[PDB]
Scaffold this active site. Structure first.
Site, short mmCIF file in Angstrom:
data_model
loop_
_atom_site.label_atom_id
_atom_site.label_comp_id
_atom_site.label_asym_id
_atom_site.label_seq_id
_atom_site.Cartn_x
_atom_site.Cartn_y
_atom_site.Cartn_z
CG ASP A 43 -0.38 0.22 2.49
OD1 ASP A 43 0.29 1.25 2.67
OD2 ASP A 43 -0.57 -0.64 3.38
C1 LIG Z 1 3.54 6.70 20.24
C2 LIG Z 1 2.19 6.26 19.67
C3 LIG Z 1 1.05 7.30 19.75
C4 LIG Z 1 0.21 7.48 18.45
C5 LIG Z 1 0.15 8.92 17.88
C6 LIG Z 1 -1.22 9.39 17.31
C7 LIG Z 1 -1.29 9.65 15.77
C8 LIG Z 1 -2.57 10.36 15.23
C9 LIG Z 1 -2.56 10.87 13.75
C10 LIG Z 1 -3.96 11.06 13.08
C11 LIG Z 1 -4.00 11.84 11.73
C12 LIG Z 1 -4.89 11.25 10.63
O1 LIG Z 1 -5.66 10.36 10.86
S1 LIG Z 1 -4.78 11.91 8.90
C13 LIG Z 1 -6.23 11.42 7.81
C14 LIG Z 1 -5.99 10.13 6.98
N1 LIG Z 1 -7.11 9.79 6.09
C15 LIG Z 1 -7.12 10.04 4.71
O2 LIG Z 1 -6.14 10.58 4.22
C16 LIG Z 1 -8.33 9.65 3.88
C17 LIG Z 1 -8.06 8.93 2.54
N2 LIG Z 1 -7.42 7.63 2.69
C18 LIG Z 1 -6.20 7.32 2.06
O3 LIG Z 1 -5.70 8.20 1.37
C19 LIG Z 1 -5.52 5.93 2.23
O4 LIG Z 1 -6.55 5.14 2.74
C20 LIG Z 1 -4.31 5.92 3.22
C21 LIG Z 1 -4.37 4.73 4.17
C22 LIG Z 1 -4.36 7.22 4.00
C23 LIG Z 1 -2.92 5.83 2.43
O5 LIG Z 1 -3.02 6.41 1.25
P1 LIG Z 1 -2.17 5.75 -0.25
O6 LIG Z 1 -3.34 5.19 -1.01
O7 LIG Z 1 -1.56 7.02 -0.76
O8 LIG Z 1 -1.21 4.73 0.33
#
Ligand SMILES: CCCCCCCCCCCC(=O)SCCNC(=O)CCNC(=O)[C@H](O)C(C)(C)COP(=O)(O)O
Ligand SMILES: CCCCCCCCCCCCCCCCCC(=O)OC[C@H](COP(=O)([O-])OCC(O)COP(=O)([O-])OC[C@@H](COC(=O)CCCCCCCCCCCCCCCCC)OC(=O)CCCCCCCCCCCCCCCCC)OC(=O)CCCCCCCCCCCCCCCCC
Ligand SMILES: CCCCCCCCCCCCCCCCCC(=O)OC[C@H](COP(=O)([O-])OCC(O)COP(=O)([O-])OC[C@@H](COC(=O)CCCCCCCCCCCCCCCCC)OC(=O)CCCCCCCCCCCCCCCCC)OC(=O)CCCCCCCCCCCCCCCCC
Ligand SMILES: CCCCCCCCCCCCCCCCCC(=O)OC[C@H](COP(=O)([O-])OCC(O)COP(=O)([O-])OC[C@@H](COC(=O)CCCCCCCCCCCCCCCCC)OC(=O)CCCCCCCCCCCCCCCCC)OC(=O)CCCCCCCCCCCCCCCCC
Ligand SMILES: CCCCCCCCCCCCCCCCCC(=O)OC[C@H](COP(=O)([O-])OCC(O)COP(=O)([O-])OC[C@@H](COC(=O)CCCCCCCCCCCCCCCCC)OC(=O)CCCCCCCCCCCCCCCCC)OC(=O)CCCCCCCCCCCCCCCCC
Ligand SMILES: CCCCCCCCCCCCCCCCC[C@@H](O)O[C@H](CO[C@H](O)CCCCCCCCCCCCCCC)COP(=O)(O)OCC[N+](C)(C)C
Ligand SMILES: CCCCCCCCCCCCCCCCC[C@@H](O)O[C@H](CO[C@H](O)CCCCCCCCCCCCCCC)COP(=O)(O)OCC[N+](C)(C)C
Ligand SMILES: CCCCCCCC/C=C\CCCCCCCC(=O)OC[C@H](COP(=O)(O)OCCN)OC(=O)CCCCCCC/C=C\CCCCCCCC
Lengths: 175, 98, 54, 140, 55, 347, 49, 88, 115, 122
Positions: H43
C-alpha cells in the site's frame, strides 16, 4: 617515620593530582584539585607556613568556584564522566595510583635514584632547624617585607593585574 | 631529598603529563595547568621554609598572583571558543594546519 | 615570436592549499579570502522549565 | 640511553660476532621504538590492535636491519683479517639496506638503501678512525 | 640511456623526489593539538633520559 | 580595539621583554615572560575572525606549558643551590628542563608545530611582531646560561629545526606559513652557534630581524597573503616585487647579499671549534629554504602571471599610509656585507 | 590640473623642509666638531703634539 | 581521503539489502524491476516507509514529490544515481 | 593534632547522622517516587544541559580581584616596619590600581550582565 | 660563550669607554664611511621609488638627511669597532707576555737543515 603524617599528606596530594589529571568531568576534576589544595595547606602548616597554606587554600577555593560555574555553562556533557565511567579515565587513574605506589615502594625500603637524586626515607622531621628564638613569625615578617623591600615586585604585580583586567575585557569583546 | 619533595615533584610530573595528554574538554586541561601551579607553590614554599630564607617568603605569593592571570586568560579564551562552537572540545580547533 | 609567460593553467598549480597535493591533502581547502570563516550557527539550546502547577 | 652505544663499542671489531650483532639489534630496536612512538603520537592508528601492529612492524624492521648490519660487518672484519677498514661497514650498510628493501618489498628502496646506508656506515667508520666530532665541545 | 635518463635519475631526480617526500611527511599535520602535545610529551621524556641521564 | 588600549598593550609586551632583559633574579625573568604573554594574547586577537581565536588559544597553551617548565627548572636549581641569580645553572636536570622550556618558547623543533598555525591564523602585523619581537627574551636568556648548556641537546634541536623548516616550507602556498618555516630554520641557525659564540647568535638575530621586517612590510604594502594574490603585484607595483625578489634572494643566503653574512660567520666559528660535519650539513640543508624562496621569486617577479580586469581601477589610487623604515630595512637586509667587521661592536 | 586640489603641491611644506635641512646641517656641524675634538684628544694622550 | 567513488552496483546492492530487510516483503521473491504496489501488494503507506529507509541508508532528503514515483527498486537506483551524479 | 581530632570528630558525627537517617526508617522506593521533580510534570530536557552564565565577565574579574586580597592581607605586619613612608606608598599604590581596575570595568560596561 | 662580555672594569651600557679616546679617530674620508653614505643614498633612492616619486631628483632634503644620518651613525660605529679590536689585541699581547711557558720562543732551523720529502710529478 613518626606518625607518618607528612608522608600521608603528600600521598593524598599525589592521589588528588592523579584524580584531576585523569581528565574526567570537570566538576569531579575541580573536587580533586580542592582536595589537593586542602592537603597541600596541611603540608605547609606542618612546616611552619601557616599564612602561605591558608592563602593558597583560600585562593584555590575561589578559583574552583569560578571553574564550577564555568563548567555548568561550557563543559557540561550530558552524561558526565566519573573515574569508573570510562575505560580511559579509569585506566589513567589506576596508572597514576600504581606509578605512585611503585615509586614510593622503590624509594622507601631501599634507596633508589629516579631522575635527580635518591631518598632513604627517615621522615621529613630530620631536616629541621633547632633554632630557638623569637617574638615574631619569620614567615610573616618575610611576607610583610614585600612592602619595604619588594617595591619593584609590587609595581610589576600591580601593573600585571590592571593589564589583566584590560586584557580579559578585550578578549571577550568579540565583534 | 626526603620523600615529601619527591611526592611534590611527582605531583608536578603527573599534572604536566595530564596537560600534555588531551582528552576532549578544554577546561580539563586548564585544571591541569592550575595543578601545575599548585605543585610549584608547594615545592617552593617547602624549600623556602626549610632553609629559612626570609625574603623569599614573598615569592610564592607573587607566584600565586600570576597563576590567576594565567587562569583568567585561559577561561577568557575558553569563552570565545565556546561562543564559536557551543562546545569547548579541542577537536574544533583544527582550522589551521602545519 | 613572443616570450612565453605563464597562463591560467600554470597559475592554478599554486592556488591549492598545499604545493604538492596528496590523496589525503587534496581534501584540504584554501582559506577564505578574508580570514573569516562562515559563522558556525551552533544551536545553543534554551533550557525548558515547568513553572507550576505545584 | 648511552649504555646501548657503549655496549656495541666496547666489543673489538672483528671479534665475538654474536655479541656485536646482539648489541646492534638492541640499538636498532630502540630506534624503531622511538620511531613508532612518534608515528603513533602524530598519526593515530584508529584502534589499539593497529597501533600494536604498526609498532611491531617498525621495531622488527629496525631491529632486523641492526642485526644484519652488525653480523655482516663483524663477519667481514673477521674473515678479511682487516679490522679498522671502512669497507666492512659499507658491506654491513648494504646488508641493512637490502634488508630494508626486503621488508618494504621494493627493489628501488633496497638499492638506494644499499648505497646510502653503506656510505653512511663507511663514513662513521672513517670518523671513528680519524676522530671526527659530530657534536664538538667548545674549546675556543 | 645515460644523459637523458640515468644521469638525471641519480643526482637531480633522486634529490627532488626525496625532498618532496620529506616535505609531504613533515607538513601533513591536521592541526590537532592533541597529537603534537603528546608528541611534546614523548620529546620531553626522551630528553630527560637520553641527554640528561648521561652528563 | 581602542588605539590607546592597543598602544598600552604593545608597551606591556615590550616592557615584559625588557624586564626579562634587565633582570638578574630568576623570578623577575619569569614575571617578564608572564607579562609578555598576558599582553601578547589580545594583540593576536585584534581582528576577531575565529581563526585568530584558534591561534591565540594554541599560542597560550604552548607558552603557558613552557612557562610552567621554566618555573619548575628555576625551583629545582634553587633546591640544589640557594641561588636566584641567573648563572650557569648548577643542576643538570634543571638545565635540561630550562633548555626545553626555552625551546618551546622559541618554537625550535620538535616544539615547532605551533609556529605555522599561529602565524597563519593571525594578521600580518601580528605575524611581524610574533616573528621578530617575541624571540628576543628567550634568546637573551639562552645567551646568559649558554656556558652550562648541553651541546648535544641544543645542537640536536638546531639541526632538527633547520631540517624541518626547510622541508616544511617546500609544501606551502600561503605566505605566512612560508614565513613561519623560514623562522624555524633561522632559529636553528641561531641556536647552533650559541654554545660556541653568543656574538654570532646576536648577529644572526639582528640580520634575521631586519630581513623579516623588510619581508613583512613588503607583504603589508601589497596586501597579499597567498602566492596567487602576490602574483598580481607586478601589474600594480613592479618596484615592490623587484625589492621583494632581492630580499628573497638575500634570505636565501646567496653572496654578496646581507643574508650570507650570518651563515658565513657561523660556519667559520664552528670550524675553530673542530666542528666540520655540523656546518656542512647545515649549509647543505639551507638550500631547501633557498628553493622555496626561488619559487616565490618565480611567481611574483621573474615571470608575469595573468591579472584581472578590476585591477585597472587600482591603477588610479596610491598607497596612502607609508612605512618610513621600509627603505632603510631593505637596504640593511641587502647591501651590508662589506661592513661585516663591525660585528666586533656586538661583543 | 587635478580634480581634488591635492593639498601637497607646488608650494612645499616649508616647515618640514626647514626642519630637514636644519637637522642635516646640525648633524654635520656636530660631526666635524666631534672629529676635531677626537683628533686633539688623541694627539694629547699619545704625546704626539 | 573522503568517501570512495560509489558506483551503480553499490547503489543496487544497498537498495536491495534495504528491501530484503523489510518485514512485509519476502526476500527471494522481490526483484530489481518488481513494482512495489503490484508485485508485492504494498500500500501507499508502506512505500513511504521504504523511502524513509532509503533516506536513512543514503543520507539525503528525498522530497515528498520525486518519492511518489519511485515505485520499483530500479527507479530508486536511477534517482540516487541522478542525485549523486554516478554514471558507470 | 587537636585540630585533626576536631575535624575527625565533626566528620564522624555528620556521617553517623547520615547513616541513622538512611538505616532507621522504612524505605519504600519505587520508580514514580524517585523521578525528578519539576512541579508535577515530567521534565522536558536534561538538567545536564548547558546553562548560560550572564555574569561570566564578573566571574573572571573576581579571580583577579581575589588575588589582590592575598597581596593586601599581610598589611597588619607591614605597618611594623621602619620604612613607613615607603610602606604606605606601596599599600596605597596597590589599592589605587585596584580601584582603577574597577573603574575601567565599570565605565566600559563590564559589570552589566549579558542579555 | 661570551669572550669579552665580562671584562673587568667594563661599564655596562657605555658604547664608548674613556680609554677609547687614546686611539686615532677614523678619518672623515674613510672608505667605510663613504660606503655608509652610499647606503644612505640608496635608502633615499628606494624611498623615492616606493613612494612613486622621480627617483633621482624628488626630495633633495630627504636624500641629504638619509646620507647624513647614515654617515653620522657610521662614524661612531667605526670608532666602537676599532676600539673593540684594539682591546682584543691588547689583551692577547698581554696574555702572551704573562704566560711565557705557553708560547715558547723556538729557534728556527734553515731550509738547508730541514729534510722535506720530494714527491715527483710524473
Ligand atoms: C507513540 C504512539 C502514539 C500514536 C500517535 C497518534 C497519531 C494520530 C494521527 C492522526 C491523523 C490522521 O488520521 S490523517 C487522515 C488520513 N485519512 C485520509 O487521508 C483519507 C483517505 N485515505 C487514504 O488516502 C488511504 O486510505 C491511506 C491509508 C491514508 C494511504 O493512502 P495511499 O493510497 O496514498 O497509500
Ligand atoms: C618531568 C617531565 C615528565 C612528565 C611525564 C611523566 C609522567 C608521570 C605520571 C604518569 C601517570 C599518568 C597519570 C595520568 C595521565 C593522563 C592520561 C590521559 O589523560 O589519557 C588521555 C588520552 C586521550 O584520552 P581520550 O581522548 O578520552 O580517549 C581516546 C581513545 O583512547 C582513542 O580511541 P581509538 O580507539 O581510536 O584509539 C585506541 C588507542 C590505542 O592506542 C594505541 O594505538 C597505541 C598502542 C601502542 C602499542 C605499544 O589510542 C590510539 O590509537 C591513539 C594513540 C594514543 C595512544 C597513547 C600514546 C602514548 C605515547 C605514544 C607511544 C605508544 C607506545 C609505542 C611504543 C613505544 C615504547 C612503549 O588517553 C590515551 O591516549 C590512551 C590512554 C592513556 C593512559 C596511559 C597514560 C600513561
Ligand atoms: C657519468 C657516470 C656514468 C654512470 C651513470 C649511469 C649508470 C649508473 C646508474 C645505472 C645503474 C643504477 C641501477 C641500480 C639498480 C636499480 C634498480 C631499480 O631501479 O629498482 C627499481 C625497479 C622497479 O622495481 P618494482 O617496480 O618495484 O618491481 C617490479 C620489477 O620491475 C619487475 O620484476 P622482475 O621479475 O622483472 O625482476 C626482478 C628480479 C628478476 O630479475 C630479472 O628479471 C632479470 C635479472 C636482473 C638482475 C641480473 C643480475 C645478474 C647478472 C649481472 C652480473 C653483473 C653484470 C655483468 C658484469 C660483468 C663483469 C665483467 O630481479 C632480481 O631478483 C635481482 C636481485 C639482485 C641481483 C643483482 C644484484 C647484483 C649486484 C652486483 C654486485 C657487484 C659487486 C662488484 C663486482 C665487481 C666486478 C664487476 O626494479 C627493477 O625493475 C630493476 C631490478 C634489477 C636490479 C639489478 C640491475 C642492476 C645491476 C647493477 C647494479 C649496480 C649499479 C649501482 C651501483 C651502486 C650500488 C651499490
Ligand atoms: C644589540 C643592539 C640592537 C638591539 C636590537 C633590539 C631589537 C630591534 C627591533 C626588534 C624588532 C622590532 C619589531 C617591532 C614590531 C612592532 C609591531 C608594530 O608596531 O606593528 C608594525 C607597524 C604596522 O603598522 P600598520 O599596520 O600600518 O598600522 C596600523 C595600526 O597598527 C592600527 O592600530 P591602531 O589603529 O590601534 O593604531 C595605534 C597606533 C598609533 O599610536 C598612538 O596613537 C599613540 C597613542 C599614545 C597612547 C599612550 C598610552 C600610554 C599608557 C600606556 C602605558 C603602558 C606602560 C607599559 C609599561 C609597564 C611597566 C611595568 O599605535 C601603534 O601602531 C603601535 C604603538 C607602539 C607603541 C610602542 C611602545 C613602546 C614600549 C617600550 C617598552 C619598554 C619600556 C621600558 C621597560 C623597562 C622594563 C620595565 O608598522 C611598523 O612598526 C613597522 C616596523 C617598525 C620596526 C622599527 C624598526 C626597529 C627599531 C628601529 C629603531 C631603533 C631601535 C633600536 C633602539 C636602540 C635603543 C635606543
Ligand atoms: C659591487 C657593486 C658596486 C655598485 C653596486 C651596484 C648595484 C645597484 C646599486 C645599489 C642599489 C641601488 C638601489 C637604488 C635604486 C632604486 C631605484 C629604482 O628602482 O630604479 C628606478 C629608476 C627609474 O625611475 P625613473 O627614471 O625616475 O622613471 C622611470 C619610471 O620610474 C619607470 O619605472 P617602473 O617602476 O615603472 O619600471 C618597472 C620596473 C621597476 O623595477 C625596478 O626599478 C628594479 C629596481 C631594483 C631593486 C633594487 C634592490 C635593492 C638593491 C640590491 C642590489 C643587490 C646587489 C648585488 C648584486 C645582485 C643584483 C640583483 O619593473 C621591472 O622592470 C620588472 C623587472 C624585474 C627584474 C628583476 C631584477 C630586479 C633587481 C635588480 C637590481 C639591480 C640594480 C638596479 C639598478 C638601478 C635601477 O632608476 C633610476 O633612475 C635610479 C638608478 C640609479 C640612480 C643613479 C643616479 C646617480 C647620478 C650620477 C652621479 C655620479 C656619481 C659620481 C660623481 C662624479 C661624477 C663626475
Ligand atoms: C547521635 C549520633 C551517634 C549515635 C550512636 C548510636 C549509633 C547507631 C548506629 C546507626 C545505624 C542505625 C540503624 C538502626 C536500625 C538497624 C538497621 C540494620 O542495622 O539492621 C539490620 C541488620 O541486619 C541485616 O539483615 C543483616 C543481619 C546479619 C547479616 C550480617 C550481620 C553479621 C553480625 C552477626 C550478628 C549475630 C549476633 C551478634 C551478637 C553481637 C538491617 O535491616 P534492614 O531492613 O536492611 O534496614 C532497615 C531497618 N528497619 C527495618 C528498622 C527499618
Ligand atoms: C643589518 C645590520 C644591523 C642593523 C642594526 C640596527 C641599526 C640601528 C642601530 C641601533 C641603535 C642603538 C645602538 C647604539 C645606541 C647606544 C648603545 C649602548 O647603549 O649599548 C651598548 C651596546 O652597543 C651595541 O651592542 C652596539 C650596536 C651596534 C649595532 C651594529 C652592528 C651590526 C653588525 C655588522 C653588520 C653591518 C652593519 C652596518 C650598518 C649599515 C652597551 O654595551 P653592552 O651593554 O655591554 O652589551 C650588551 C650585550 N652584551 C652584554 C650581551 C654583550
Ligand atoms: C637530508 C636533506 C637533504 C637536503 C638536500 C637538498 C638538495 C638540494 C635540492 C633541493 C631541491 C628540492 C626541489 C623539489 O624537491 O621539488 C620537487 C618538485 C615539485 O614541483 P614544485 O617545485 O613544487 O613546483 C611545480 C609543481 N607544481 O619537482 C620538481 O619540479 C623538481 C625541479 C627542480 C629540480 C632541481 C634539483 C637539482 C639538484 C641536482 C643535484 C644536487 C641536489 C642537492 C644535493 C646534491 C648532493 C649532495
Amino acid at each position: 617515620m613518626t606518625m607518618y603524617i607528612a608522608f600521608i599528606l603528600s600521598t593524598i596530594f599525589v592521589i588528588g593530582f592523579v584524580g584531576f589529571s585523569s581528565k574526567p568531568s570537570p566538576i569531579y576534576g575541580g573536587l580533586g584539585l580542592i582536595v589537593s589544595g586542602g592537603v597541600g595547606c596541611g603540608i605547609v602548616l606542618n612546616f611552619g607556613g601557616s599564612f602561605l597554606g591558608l592563602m593558597v587554600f583560600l585562593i584555590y577555593l575561589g578559583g574552583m568556584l569560578v571553574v564550577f560555574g564555568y563548567t555548568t555553562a561550557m563543559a557540561t556533557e550530558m552524561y558526565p564522566e566519573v573515574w569508573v565511567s570510562n575505560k580511559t579515565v579509569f585506566g589513567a587513574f589506576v596508572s597514576g595510583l600504581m606509578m605512585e605506589f611503585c615509586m614510593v615502594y622503590y624509594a622507601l625500603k631501599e634507596e633508589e635514584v629516579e631522575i635527580i637524586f635518591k631518598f632513604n626515607g627517615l621522615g621529613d622531621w630530620v631536616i629541621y632547624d633547632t633554632g630557638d628564638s623569637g617574638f615574631f613569625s619569620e614567615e610573616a615578617m618575610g611576607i610583610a617585607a614585600l612592602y619595604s623591600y619588594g617595591t619593584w615586585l609590587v609595581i610589576v604585580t600591580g601593573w600585571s593585574l590592571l593589564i589583566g583586567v584590560v586584557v580579559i575585557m578585550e578578549i571577550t569583546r568579540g565583534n | 631529598m626526603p620523600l615529601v619533595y619527591m611526592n611534590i615533584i611527582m605531583a608536578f610530573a603527573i599534572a604536566l603529563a595530564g596537560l600534555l595528554m588531551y582528552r576532549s574538554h578544554l577546561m580539563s586541561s586548564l585544571l591541569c595547568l592550575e595543578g601545575m601551579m599548585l605543585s610549584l607553590f608547594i615545592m617552593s614554599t617547602l624549600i623556602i621554609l626549610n632553609t629559612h630564607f626570609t625574603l623569599a617568603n614573598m615569592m610564592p605569593i607573587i607566584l600565586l598572583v600570576f597563576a590567576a592571570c594565567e587562569a583568567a586568560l585561559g577561561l577568557s579564551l575558553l569563552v570565545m571558543v565556546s561562543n564559536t562552537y557551543g562546545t569547548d572540545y579541542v577537536q574544533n580547533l583544527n582550522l589551521l594546519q602545519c | 615570436a613572443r616570450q612565453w609567460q605563464p597562463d591560467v593553467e600554470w597559475a592554478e598549480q599554486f592556488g591549492g592549499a598545499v604545493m604538492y597535493p596528496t590523496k589525503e591533502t587534496a581534501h584540504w581547502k584554501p582559506p577564505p579570502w578574508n580570514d573569516v570563516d562562515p559563522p558556525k550557527d551552533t544551536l545553543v539550546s534554551n533550557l525548558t522549565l515547568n513553572f507550576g502547577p505545584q | 640511553a648511552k649504555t646501548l652505544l657503549h655496549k656495541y663499542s666496547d666489543i673489538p671489531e672483528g671479534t665475538e660476532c654474536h655479541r656485536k650483532a646482539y648489541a646492534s639489534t638492541s640499538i636498532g630496536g630502540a630506534t624503531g621504538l622511538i620511531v613508532s612512538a612518534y608515528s603513533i603520537a602524530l598519526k593515530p592508528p584508529a584502534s589499539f590492535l593497529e597501533g600494536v601492529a604498526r609498532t611491531g612492524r617498525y621495531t622488527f624492521t629496525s631491529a632486523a636491519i641492526g642485526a644484519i648490519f652488525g653480523l655482516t660487518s663483524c663477519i667481514s672484519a673477521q674473515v678479511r683479517e682487516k679490522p679498522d677498514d671502512p669497507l666492512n661497514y659499507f658491506i654491513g650498510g648494504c646488508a641493512g639496506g637490502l634488508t630494508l628493501g626486503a621488508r618494504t618489498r621494493s627493489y628501488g628502496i633496497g638499492a638506494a638503501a644499499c648505497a646510502y646506508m653503506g656510505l653512511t656506515a663507511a663514513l662513521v667508520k672513517m670518523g671513528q678512525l680519524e676522530g671526527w666530532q659530530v657534536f664538538a665541545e667548545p674549546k675556543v | 640511456l645515460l644523459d637523458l635518463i640515468w644521469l638525471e635519475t641519480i643526482l637531480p631526480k633522486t634529490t627532488s623526489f626525496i625532498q618532496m617526500k620529506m616535505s609531504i611527511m613533515v607538513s601533513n599535520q591536521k592541526g590537532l593539538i592533541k597529537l603534537y602535545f603528546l608528541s611534546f610529551l614523548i620529546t620531553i621524556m626522551i630528553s630527560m633520559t637520553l641527554f640528561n641521564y648521561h652528563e | 580595539m581602542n588605539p590607546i588600549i592597543y598602544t598600552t598593550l604593545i608597551m606591556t609586551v615590550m616592557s615584559g621583554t625588557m624586564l626579562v632583559m634587565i633582570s638578574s633574579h630568576w623570578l623577575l625573568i619569569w614575571i617578564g615572560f608572564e607579562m609578555n604573554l598576558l599582553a601578547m594574547i589580545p594583540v593576536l586577537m585584534k581582528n576577531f575572525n575565529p581563526r585568530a581565536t584558534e591561534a591565540a588559544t594554541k599560542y597560550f597553551l604552548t607558552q603557558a606549558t613552557a612557562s610552567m617548565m621554566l618555573m619548575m627548572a628555576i625551583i629545582i636549581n634553587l633546591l640544589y643551590s640557594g641561588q636566584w641569580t641567573i648563572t650557569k645553572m648548577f643542576n643538570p636536570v634543571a638545565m635540561t628542563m630550562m633548555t626545553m622550556a626555552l625551546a618551546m618558547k622559541l618554537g625550535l623543533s620538535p616544539f615547532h608545530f605551533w609556529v605555522p598555525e599561529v602565524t597563519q591564523g593571525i594578521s600580518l602585523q601580528a605575524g611581524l611582531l610574533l616573528l621578530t619581537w617575541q624571540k628576543l627574551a628567550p634568546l637573551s636568556v639562552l645567551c646568559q646560561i649558554s656556558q652550562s648548556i648541553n651541546p648535544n641537546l641544543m645542537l640536536t634541536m638546531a639541526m632538527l629545526s633547520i631540517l624541518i623548516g626547510g622541508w616544511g616550507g617546500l609544501n606551502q602556498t600561503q605566505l605566512r606559513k612560508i614565513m613561519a618555516y623560514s623562522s624555524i630554520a633561522h632559529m636553528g641557525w641561531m641556536t647552533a652557534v650559541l654554545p660556541y659564540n653568543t656574538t654570532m647568535t646576536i648577529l644572526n638575530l639582528l640580520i634575521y630581524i631586519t630581513m623579516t621586517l623588510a619581508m613583512f612590510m613588503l607583504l603589508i604594502h601589497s596586501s597579499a597573503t597567498t602566492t596567487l594574490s602576490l602574483s598580481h603585484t607586478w601589474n600594480k607595483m613592479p618596484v615592490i616585487t623587484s625589492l621583494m625578489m632581492v630580499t628573497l634572494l638575500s634570505m636565501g643566503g646567496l653572496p654578496p647579499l646581507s643574508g650570507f653574512m650570518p651563515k658565513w660567520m657561523i660556519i667559520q666559528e664552528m670550524t675553530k671549534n673542530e666542528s666540520i660535519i655540523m656546518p656542512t650539513l647545515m649549509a647543505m640543508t639551507a638550500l631547501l629554504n633557498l628553493y622555496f624562496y626561488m619559487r616565490l621569486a618565480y611567481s611574483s617577479s621573474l615571470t608575469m602571471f595573468p591579472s584581472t580586469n578590476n585591477m585597472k581601477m587600482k591603477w588610479q589610487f596610491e598607497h596612502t599610509k607609508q612605512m618610513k623604515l621600509l627603505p632603510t630595512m631593505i637596504v640593511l637586509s641587502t647591501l651590508v656585507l662589506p661592513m661585516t667587521p663591525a660585528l666586533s661592536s656586538l661583543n | 590640473k587635478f580634480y581634488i586640489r591635492e593639498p601637497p603641491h607646488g608650494s612645499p611644506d616649508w616647515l618640514k623642509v626647514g626642519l630637514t635641512l636644519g637637522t642635516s646641517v646640525f648633524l654635520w656641524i656636530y660631526l666635524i666638531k666631534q672629529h676635531k675634538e677626537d683628533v686633539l684628544e688623541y694627539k694629547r694622550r699619545n704625546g704626539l703634539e | 581521503s573522503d568517501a570512495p567513488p560509489l558506483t551503480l552496483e553499490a547503489i543496487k546492492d544497498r537498495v536491495l539489502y534495504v528491501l530484503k530487510l523489510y518485514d512485509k516483503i519476502d526476500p527471494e521473491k522481490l526483484s530489481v524491476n518488481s513494482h512495489f504496489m503490484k508485485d508485492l501488494g504494498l500500500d501507499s503507506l508502506d512505500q513511504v516507509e521504504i523511502i524513509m529507509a532509503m533516506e536513512d541508508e543514503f543520507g539525503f532528503e528525498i522530497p515528498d514529490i520525486d518519492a511518489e514515483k519511485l515505485m520499483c527498486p530500479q527507479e530508486i537506483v536511477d534517482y540516487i544515481a541522478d542525485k549523486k551524479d554516478v554514471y558507470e | 593534632m587537636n585540630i585533626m581530632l576536631t575535624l575527625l570528630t565533626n566528620v564522624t558525627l555528620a556521617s553517623l547522622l547520615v547513616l541513622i537517617a538512611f538505616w532507621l526508617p522504612q524505605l519504600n522506593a519505587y520508580s514514580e517516587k524517585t523521578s525528578p521533580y519539576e512541579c508535577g510534570f515530567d521534565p522536558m530536557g536534561s538538567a545536564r544541559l548547558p546553562f548560560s552564565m550572564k555574569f561570566f565577565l564578573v566571574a573572571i574579574t573576581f579571580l583577579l580581584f581575589d588575588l589582590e586580597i592575598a597581596l593586601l592581607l599581610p598589611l597588619p605586619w607591614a605597618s611594623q616596619t621602619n620604612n613607613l613612608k615607603t610602606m604606605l606608598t606601596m599599600a596605597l599604590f596597590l589599592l589605587i590600581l585596584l580601584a582603577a581596575s574597577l573603574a575601567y570595568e565599570w565605565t566600559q560596561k563590564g559589570l552589566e550582565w549579558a542579555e | 660563550m661570551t669572550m669579552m662580555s665580562g671584562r673587568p672594569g667594563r661599564v655596562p651600557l657605555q658604547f664608548l669607554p674613556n680609554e677609547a679616546r687614546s686611539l686615532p679617530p677614523p678619518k672623515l674620508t674613510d672608505p667605510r664611511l663613504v660606503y655608509m653614505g652610499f647606503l644612505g643614498y640608496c635608502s633615499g633612492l628606494i624611498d623615492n621609488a616606493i613612494r612613486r616619486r622621480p627617483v633621482v631628483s624628488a626630495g633633495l632634503h630627504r636624500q641629504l638627511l638619509y646620507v647624513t644620518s647614515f654617515v653620522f651613525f657610521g662614524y661612531y660605529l667605526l670608532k666602537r669597532q676599532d676600539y673593540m679590536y684594539a682591546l682584543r689585541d691588547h689583551d692577547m699581547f698581554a696574555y702572551v707576555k704573562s704566560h711565557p711557558e705557553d708560547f715558547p720562543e723556538k729557534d728556527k732551523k734553515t731550509y738547508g737543515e730541514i729534510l722535506e720529502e720530494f714527491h715527483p710529478v710524473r
